[PDB]
Design a protein around this ligand. Structure first.
Ligand SMILES: NC(=O)c1ccc[n+]([C@@H]2O[C@H](COP(=O)([O-])OP(=O)(O)OC[C@H]3O[C@@H](n4cnc5c(N)ncnc54)[C@H](OP(=O)(O)O)[C@@H]3O)[C@@H](O)[C@H]2O)c1
Ligand SMILES: Nc1nc(=O)c2nc(CNc3ccc(C(=O)N[C@@H](CCC(=O)O)C(=O)O)cc3)cnc2[nH]1
Ligand SMILES: [Mn+2]
Ligand SMILES: [Mn+2]
Length: 159
């Protein structure tokens, strides 16, 4: 199955100028625990934002052009990306906006972080029809000495 995982600010903002302009250690820890030991699929801009491979995960980068780093696996279409993951239980799509929009129709779960932050952005999570998803997990946290905003982890499953 295919899952998307994302962090959303107000208005579905997910990025600005190829970065995420918040800093939430709790949410990066949640990202790691939900992705480790799985394939991750990302677009080339997100690969450039992360700036290095992610350890302990098969890294599969979508680009139309040939790859430039053999520490990761480069593919040129959605179907090739899926094929390159092999027979695993859960593929994790880790963005960015253009890649999320393509994989939404093929996905069974969304792991969302809802962050209580108002920021300007240039990238959004795709609009998703709410009726088609059920919430199966919703865990709220107030801001603390490490995490400057409140946030909510949510898992949704396609009904
Ligand atoms: N908040 C979050 O959870 C989160 C998560 C991920 C990313 N982000 C943010 O999202 C932004 C990046 O997103 P983005 O929408 O600009 O870009 P993106 O989706 O990461 O990358 C798009 C690129 O991927 C390639 N691509 C996409 N679909 C393809 C396909 N079907 N076949 C072949 N290649 C394909 C293309 O590369 P080529 O141009 O090389 O052909 C395309 O330009 C950044 O601001 C980043 O910080 C936020
Ligand atoms: N929930 C969620 N939060 C995010 O921040 C996020 N970011 C991306 C894309 N960007 C990034 C940027 C950095 C790292 C990162 O450094 N993660 C490391 C270390 C985590 C840490 O230092 O705590 C990792 O091992 O996963 C991952 C993805 C995709 N999905 C997400 N999903
Ligand atoms: Mn805030
Ligand atoms: Mn909900």
């Amino acid at each position: 199955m295919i899952s998307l995982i994302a962090a959303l600010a107000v208005d579905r903002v997910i990025g600005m100028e190829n970065a995420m302009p918040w800093n939430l250690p709790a949410d990066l820890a949640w990202f790691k625990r939900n992705t480790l030991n799985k394939p991750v699929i990302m677009g080339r801009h997100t690969w450039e934002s992360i700036g290095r491979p992610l350890p302990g995960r098969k890294n599969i980068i979508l680009s139309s052009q040939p790859g430039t780093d053999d520490r990761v696996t480069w593919v040129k279409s959605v179907d090739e990306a899926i094929a390159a993951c092999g027979d695993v239980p859960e593929i994790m799509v880790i963005g960015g906006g253009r890649v999320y929009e393509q994989f939404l129709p093929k996905a069974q779960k969304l792991y969302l972080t809802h962050i209580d932050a108002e920021v300007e952005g240039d990238t959004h999570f795709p609009d998703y029809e709410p009726d088609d998803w059920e919430s199966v997990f919703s865990e709220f946290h107030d801001a603390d000495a490490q995490n400057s905003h409140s946030y909510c982890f949510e898992i949704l499953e396609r009904r």
